[PDB]
Design an enzyme around this catalytic site. Structure first.
Site, PDB file in Angstrom:
ATOM      1  N   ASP A  77      29.490  41.421  32.887  1.00 42.95           N
ATOM      2  CA  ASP A  77      30.792  41.885  32.675  1.00 42.95           C
ATOM      3  C   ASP A  77      31.202  41.328  31.371  1.00 42.95           C
ATOM      4  OD1 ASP A  77      33.651  42.688  33.984  1.00 42.95           O
ATOM      5  OD2 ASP A  77      34.130  40.855  33.196  1.00 42.95           O
TER       6      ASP A  77
ATOM      7  N   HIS B 232      30.220  46.697  41.044  1.00 46.73           N
ATOM      8  CA  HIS B 232      30.329  45.483  39.945  1.00 46.73           C
ATOM      9  C   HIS B 232      29.786  44.396  40.080  1.00 46.73           C
ATOM     10  CE1 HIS B 232      32.122  44.057  36.074  1.00 46.73           C
ATOM     11  NE2 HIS B 232      32.475  43.109  37.005  1.00 46.73           N
TER      12      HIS B 232
END
Ligand SMILES: O=C(NCCCc1ccccc1)N[C@H]1CC[C@@H](OCc2c(F)cccc2F)CC1
Length: 336
Positions: free
Chosen positions: A116, A313
């Site tokens: 991320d 994610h």
């Protein structure tokens, strides 16, 4: 050695702070099994913390690596400065460089991994400190070029571009910071961020609008955290002084500062180039960072290994065993 994921306050690791470039940095330290091969530094993103590497840390230890996983600037036991310049990818890279060398010596090298925002950090760290970074991988986050100009994200999404990033407008603003205060709200926030849904499937978070404040009251248990993990995120985020999310949301307030640093690099600095072995692990169901976003990235690397795991994610946890094997096999070949 027990290679299962870290539990909250796992005793297989140590929890320490060091002064780093003017800030207290908290981190998880895991010592290797067998003679140390390398030191691995692991960088989390938003809204995560060092514990987000809970699958990778014992694994890398069992592979013979020393593992340093900081709570990054703004998060949990690490300081949250008021100065946004402390939150640029360049300054945070310098932070990682000093923390790394505080373990391996100034002449040392590390393996560096990110996810991320952390993924963005480690590419920049590998760019700003190639003396230090022997190998670098990123989960979900592909390389983005050196910013050659600054455009406000408002004007970008208003023209229809980078629509998968429009949630960052809310994040940089006052709404999330002002509303998500105290453990009660943080608990709801985390149920939202890790996939919980409401009685009609209302999502607590979307890449379009960010946190759906009106949904947090009905948000159910998240599939991607168990109850004690959820409480651990709440406890650790609570270490920040109210408003607890100020520090983490600062990562969305540096677009212009980052653009100014990197426009300087685009003009005079060296090219964005990676000579060391590098790994990019794409996530198929990451709708914030879809795999297509990495197209053309390979031209910036001498030695880029690509993988892809079927996961949202949250691939470090949802696909922890697969991610682990990908890192392990790549590292086994990168270092030899
Ligand atoms: O904020 C982030 N994730 C928040 C959580 C996402 C989520 C989705 C679904 C459920 C829960 C959470 N990620 C950052 C990662 C680094 C930043 O990279 C800069 C950058 C560019 F400017 C342009 C092209 C690529 C590129 F990487 C971009 C957003």
């Amino acid at each position: 050695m027990d290679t299962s994921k870290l539990k909250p306050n796992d005793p297989r690791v140590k929890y320490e702070t060091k002064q780093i470039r003017g800030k207290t940095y908290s981190y998880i330290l895991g010592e290797p099994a067998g003679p140390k091969l390398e030191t691995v530094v692991l960088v989390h993103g938003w809204p995560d913390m060092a514990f987000g590497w809970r699958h990778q840390i014992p694994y890398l230890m069992s592979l013979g690596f020393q593992v340093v996983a900081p709570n990054m600037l703004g998060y949990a036991g690490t300081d949250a400065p008021r100065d946004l310049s402390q939150f640029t990818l360049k300054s945070v890279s310098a932070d990682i460089a000093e923390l790394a060398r505080s373990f391996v010596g100034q002449d040392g090298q590390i393996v560096l991994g990110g996810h991320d925002w952390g993924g963005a950090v480690v590419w920049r760290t590998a760019y700003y400190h190639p003396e230090l970074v022997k190998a670098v991988f990123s989960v979900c986050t592909p390389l983005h070029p050196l910013s050659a100009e600054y455009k406000p994200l408002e004007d970008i999404v208003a023209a229809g571009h980078m629509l998968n990033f429009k949630y960052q407008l809310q994040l940089k603003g006052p709404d999330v910071e002002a509303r998500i205060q105290g453990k009660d709200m943080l608990r709801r926030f985390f149920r939202a961020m890790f996939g919980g849904r409401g009685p009609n499937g209302e999502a607590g978070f979307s890449t379009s609008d960010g946190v759906h404040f009106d949904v947090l009251d009905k948000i159910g248990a998240p599939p991607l955290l168990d109850e004690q993990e959820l409480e651990y995120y709440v406890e650790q985020y609570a270490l920040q002084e109210a408003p607890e999310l100020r520090g983490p949301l600062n990562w969305y307030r540096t677009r212009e500062l980052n653009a100014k640093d990197e426009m300087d690099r685009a003009k005079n600095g060296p090219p964005l180039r990676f000579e060391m072995p590098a790994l990019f692990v794409a996530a198929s169901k990451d709708n914030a960072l879809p795999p297509a976003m990495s197209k053309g990235m390979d031209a910036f690397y001498k030695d880029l290994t690509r993988a892809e795991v079927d996961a949202t994610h949250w691939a470090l946890t949802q696909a922890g065993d697969e991610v682990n094997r990908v890192i392990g096999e790549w590292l086994n070949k990168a270092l030899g």
